[PDB]
Symmetry: D3
Subunit: 252 residues, 6 copies
């Protein structure tokens, strides 16, 4: 049950990812064979739930690409449910301060380190108790990534980076650009300045920076600045744009 994504990040190995919003275990398997280091199953902005996360985890399982899951909110209940179907790496939206970051971490750990609910007998996570000593091994293989997505989050970043158990800090540019007054224009220089400053600040604390960006040149820039988990595209967009451009080339 070693979490290989977590190990790679701790080792400073950059991981290239794809964001999955098609909410299908079928297209998930198709994309699991595409060569990405990680895949993000989006429970916040795509029509996923615990049940569809489960089937996408099952589809992805035999492939080299590692799954990461975003809950719809920093909710300990939903987090519990996602961990039990086998989620080991979690990308938590809208973490605004160190207290919220701490609660995200505590939501993933069994007592006394946290408040994760115990139900190993019926969890896929323990393979229904086939994994020996699962309850003693689980906490150390959880990888908690928190999203900073507002000015308020930026103010609290130094404190957030001091929270033990926060393995990575992810910058959400859509939300950040909107909160900064540039909605839909994360490429704006003021937003970019905040993003670059944050990436360096995160890496400088010895934690892993991450980000999603559709511009491949920006993605390379962030990697140069020390980003360690970079999502470089989104499935819905890849499909829609490729389809539209094809139709257009035939005058449809």
């Amino acid at each position: 049950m070693e979490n290989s994504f977590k190990a790679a990040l701790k080792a400073g190995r950059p991981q290239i990812g794809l964001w999955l919003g098609l909410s299908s275990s079928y297209s998930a398997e198709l994309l699991a064979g595409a060569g990405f280091d990680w895949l993000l199953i989006d429970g916040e902005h795509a029509p996923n739930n615990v049940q569809t996360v489960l089937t996408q985890l099952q589809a992805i399982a035999p492939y080299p690409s590692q799954p990461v899951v975003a809950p719809s909110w920093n909710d300990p209940v939903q987090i519990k449910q996602l961990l039990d179907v086998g989620t080991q790496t979690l990308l938590v939206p809208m973490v605004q301060n160190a207290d919220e970051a701490r609660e995200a971490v505590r939501a993933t750990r069994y007592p006394p380190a946290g408040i994760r609910g115990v139900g190993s007998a019926l969890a896929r996570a323990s393979r229904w108790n086939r994994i020996p000593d699962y309850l003693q091994k689980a906490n150390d293989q959880m990888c908690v990534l928190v999203q900073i997505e507002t000015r308020e989050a930026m103010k609290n970043l130094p404190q957030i980076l001091d929270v033990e158990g926060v393995d990575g800090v992810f910058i959400g540019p859509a939300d950040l650009s909107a909160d900064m007054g540039y909605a839909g224009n994360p490429q704006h220089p003021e937003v970019q300045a905040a993003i670059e400053q944050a990436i360096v600040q995160i890496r400088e604390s010895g934690k892993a920076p991450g980000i999603l960006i559709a511009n491949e040149q920006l993605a390379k820039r962030y990697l140069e600045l020390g980003a360690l988990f970079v999502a470089v595209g989104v499935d819905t967009t890849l499909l829609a744009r490729a389809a539209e451009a094809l139709a257009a080339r035939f005058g449809a």
Copy 2:
């Protein structure tokens, strides 16, 4: 992406609705062709979730009937999710005061006007970013309808009616009659007085009054008093009652 239901309410055009509790994209399509101005996908009291709301929206889409969604609660996370699958008109249950009404409005609006989370590449709402100016146009096409459903809510109605972004106020007679101590009996005179008083107060404010009522004579009365979005039946009831009546017209059979 302009919200035609919102525009109709703003113009003062009465809209006749059916409540959908069958939680099926199939029956949703069947009912979408029946001639209603609006259909309510009930996420509060029917076994719906974000995924089933999506398929019902897809089913209804080619028809003129406009979808409205009731979330299970005034919860910004659920509202975010419903909006991203394409919900533009929301009927929020159990809005008790103007602070709650304001929170419902803010949940539907992107910053700085609200706290709606941004995920347009993934959203049916933006047609997966096919709408270039989606983020700039979205707020103005959201239609927030708040349900007042308790004695407490009725006391707060004047302040609720001043909340910018509340486009309509809907009276929920089942919850209201129960809160008033008349469960299952909205026909009661004290309940009817609170309802009529509320419709008139809403009307005078310039916002749209709405209500659900299965009694067609009451429905007509409410429309006469100025109600602008009136749901006049429920799919489960229509089906059950028509089926029960039909079986009964044949009754028990003689053994021969």
Copy 3:
């Protein structure tokens, strides 16, 4: 595991039914409480499969109303599958002659009386072998109903009524009226003559006549002539027409 629909046909007690085409286990439950003697899960003209039939059977189970299933065709493999999920009364479409009726019967019976495939350990039908002597009891609780739906079938009614194991013969007025040249108009005198003649003919053989008809006055006539399983409405129609009438009472009118 007694087939009470079958027993009622044998008692001579007419059974009033509703046709289910909403293809939902939720609306199936709602309608199971509506007071019908039987409910037809339509696998031919509604978007059902073996899986949705199963969930509809589960939904209906605690209610008095008895389920009947129409497969999409007289196909022994599909029939095998529907029986294993627990179907005991079948309404087979487009049965054109005695050969086809015999094949429908044999599809429902274990050897040597037929060719039903054996898989009781897996089957809801046996409650996963919880029911003792299931394999020895099952054949006799099957109720085979065959639809006659064309001029050819009507012509061949006498041979069909001689088939052992055919418990009832059901007239399908939509397909019949179309085949007769009156599509959409089963109320045509020529179609009604064929229907009434058939009902009497079936009644006389000792087998049960059945029919689906949305006109209530016609239904009462068919009952008067001896019909024993009469479906008197369709869920999709009841809902659609009720919704439409309601909207209209508030529209232009």
Copy 4:
């Protein structure tokens, strides 16, 4: 509408249960015929939601075994939704004190007794308004069981037992053992001591004690100590362990 699990509880009848985590209406039906007094549909630790709870309730309905549902948390909204699809017995997780217990009770009762939202017309719970007088009878048929799963809850037990409407108090050994420093080892003597003490307090207060324990010898011990709703197995475990043993018997030794 009569809640027979609640009735049994009030009569002091010990009820033997099976925990369901397979999240399937198909295996639910198979297990509903197995002879258990009750079945726990786990909304907290199995991949269930309101919709799958509904289908499992429909599957279980015609059997004697009574359903109990664990919501994922003490959340009035989820509780409202679970009640409307027909849940009458709730096993609420992580109830830490008396205030939380009272809020669980209030979430199940209509005004003016509580805050349960009213939507009887489209609820399976009322059979779509086919149950009279549903709204007047519903509150009394709700059965609220609260789970005590931490040292804090154990400390607060005396006060929790004083909450009207709490019909039963359930000890969660997995969560309790972890909270006490023995994760994966509820067998441990000190955990056992805490469990046995709680059962006594509960029984002596006049409320029903409950527990889940897969070790049958410990189950029988808890029953002897006065526990009244005891879940003695988990479907996933029964299936996994049985399959593993079968495979191993055909492998080396």
Copy 5:
């Protein structure tokens, strides 16, 4: 209930299509807004059934793109079922001769023209009997497209082209190339020759030629030769190829 795809083929307006194998009503909607003239819901080689076809038809409905459905075989029962959920254009696989083509036609028509079973009260196709005189109007709005996919079928093309109610003839290049001994790869001179001669012959008969090909240069060539329904890509391929190229630009490789 007017079948506009049929009307386009009859008018000689070339229709550009995309093949749908993702078997999802969600991606079907996303693709329905991409600007194609038609979309093929593949019930033969993708994990679809009558129920999933229905949901895809519903997702596609409000968009201009017209749905076409390939059943898994020329089976009148499956055809009956597909039609009742609202399919009006069928792409029937492995039609080998004129008799089989005629049987495909008859499966889509009510008596006396065919053997389609009558179930209009519960069919989406009639909008649950809201379309007045549906039973009298339905036949003329059915569009039957037959796939020729073997050397035998190619030999029988002249006779297949003489079958009334066959509105179009589609060449299946993967199956045809396999039958010709090229193991599913149609990019050989002799396969191309067979395809091109067939397109010309179909068009000269006054029927619509169709084809699926992922190579855009070949698609353009087939349009130049008179093909009227050309599918120019497959959803699974577009997605897989787009994703793999993207990973490869960051060094991430699956090859």
Copy 6:
């Protein structure tokens, strides 16, 4: 994409299986970790279809246990569909003679060897065209097992064994006992005699015998006789019987 089950049978290595009729990708995963050599997804007597077969194959994929699928009938179209979602080993019910065996084989092979329809671009089987030279390599990794389940099939067994592409012959005791006149009692000596004779006959032709039997003593005997793919239990039975026995230990009375 090598079929390891097929290779095992060829090598004469016995494979222990579990029959899956719970029709769930969730329980399929749970049972995939249980230690079996193979798992039978039953499309004939459990409520499965191509779509549910697909999700069970996906669930099973990262485990050692190899999937086998039983179609509902020897139907080329259904076989085509099952193969495209990734099925490589088929257990075909009610194969009665050599013509039927030969047609099962042809249904699994691309031309010229068979009539399997070509749709590689959208098949999980080819992993959407990532498996190089899939169409050229697919035929040799297909494993065709035919079920003999009637007296007629028994009579025709020698010719069935003489059809190339038939990799294994499976005896279906429930159907066979019924056709023989002992419905529900496979244990009857006359059925057992037929079964044992068939097993030796299959082994002697060089091909792999298989059977399903829930009685573990009988299973061991069939293995001793040279059966090479033996299913020793059924998921639904395992679960129902274990649950019932548990309830009964606490007082449950029928």
